[PDB]
RNA sequence: AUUUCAAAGAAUCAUUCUUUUUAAAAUCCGAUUUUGUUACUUUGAGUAAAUUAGAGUGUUCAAAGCAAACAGUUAAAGCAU
């Protein structure tokens, strides 16, 4: 049936809710979205809380090819439709594969840099911030010996009123995906 | 310049030392175990003694030596059948 059309693999509650919501978005076609969301198909979902214990965040995993072709083009409008439908913060990421440098794959003349840890984690940082684009990066080394990622955002999405909530949400999601402590902010 | 960052636990005085897990492929019965070359570095192996450093040992002491020690005015003791 219509769930298995867009849902990648045998499922639990939240994967089905997102898939149904996407089909609902596909069906109605009255918003300022072109060819709707029709080719988007979802790999997986996670639900995560932040520092504050309410208005949780949903991570959405997408197959790289799909993300690159379809999702990226319409991203601001699409994410807003998801926010409207499910009363939660949604964040979209592309599944990139990561390979250790000497480990040795059947394909490839040595490991491609696109498959390196550092490049992929930089790429995911672009994915999570995506309604904005990164202004500059700064890694602070505290006396503790931990490292803090001060990630500075542009200025476009400073006007919409979900700002602080989004920044905390991004920090949380970056931490669950990649084991680091980030903080996010915007210039004066 | 650049290609794998980290996270959790126990010991100990408040630091230190130690263990766990965290990508991907092949392989072995949803679980189990392999993955550039070389320098470098770690352990090791196999190394003549004398010499030399060095442990043991009151050559009268020392330089030395490679020995010695013990009980017994003459037997006890041990263990051998």
Resolution in Å, one decimal, please.
Answer: 6.7
Q: Which residue has the tokens 């965040």?
A: A57
How far apart are alpha carbons A11 and A146 in whole angstroms? Answer: 37
Region of residue A143 (phi > 0: left; psi between -120 and 50: alpha; otherwise: beta):
alpha
Contact residues for A115 (Cβ-Cβ < 8 A; gap 6+):
A96, A97, A98, A99
CA distance A141 to A68: 34
Tokens of A146: 């931990």
Query: A101: which nucleotide lies closest, measuring CA to C1'?
Result: B3
Q: In the beta sheet, which residues pair with residue A42? A: A7
Both tokens of residue A99?
């390979």
**Residue bearing tokens 């490839």:** A108
Neighbours of A107 (CB within 10 A): 5
Closest protein CA to C1' of nucleotide B34, residue: A103
b/e map A56-69, b = 16+ CB within 10 Å: ebbbbbbbeebbee
Q: Cα A181 to the chain's mean position, in Å?
A: 17
Strand B nucleotides in reach of protein CB atoms, 7 A cut-off: 2-7, 23-26, 35-36
Of chain A, the end-to-end C-alpha distance in Å amounts to 51
- Strand B: which residues have Cβ below 7 Å from it? A 97-106, 110-111, 113, 116-119, 146-147, 178-180
Q: How far apart are CA A89 and CA A124, in angstroms?
A: 17
Distance (Å) of CA A89 to CA A37, A38, A121, A132, A180 = 18, 22, 21, 15, 21
**Which residues neighbour A110 within 8 Å (Cβ) at sequence distance 6 or greater?**
none
Residue A167 burial by Cβ neighbours in a 10 Å radius (0-12, 13-18, 19+):
buried
| β pairing state of A134-141 and A181-185 | unpaired
d(CA A106, CA A103): 10
Secondary structure (DSSP) of chain A: -HHHHHB-SS--HHHHHHHHHHHHHHHH--SS-SSTTTT--B-EEEEE--SSSSS-EEEEEEEHHHHHHTGGGGHHHHHHHHHHHSSSEEEEEEE-----TTS--SSSSS--GGGSHHHHHHHHHHHHHTTS-EEEEEEEE-TTS-EEEEEEE-SGGGSSTTHHHHHHHHHHHHHHHSS-EEEEE---
């Amino acid at each position: 049936a219509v769930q298995k059309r867009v849902l990648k693999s045998n499922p639990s509650d939240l994967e089905k809710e997102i898939a149904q919501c996407l089909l609902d978005i596909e069906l109605s076609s009255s918003s300022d979205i072109k060819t709707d969301a029709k080719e988007i198909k979802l790999l997986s979902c996670d639900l995560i809380e932040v520092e504050k214990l309410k208005k949780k965040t949903i991570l959405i995993y997408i197959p790289y090819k799909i993300y690159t072709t379809y999702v990226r083009k319409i991203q601001r409008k699409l994410i807003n439709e998801l926010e409207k439908k499910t009363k939660k913060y949604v964040v979209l990421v592309a599944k990139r594969t990561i390979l250790k440098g000497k480990q040795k794959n059947k394909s490839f003349k040595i490991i491609p840099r696109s498959r390196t840890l550092t490049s992929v984690y930089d790429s995911i940082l672009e994915d999570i911030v995506s309604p904005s684009e990164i202004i500059g990066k700064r890694i602070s080394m505290k006396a503790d010996g931990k490292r803090v990622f001060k990630i500075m955002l542009d200025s476009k999405e400073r006007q919409r009123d979900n700002i602080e909530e989004k920044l905390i949400s991004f920090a949380a999601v970056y931490k669950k995906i990649t084991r680091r402590d980030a903080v996010f902010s915007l210039p004066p």
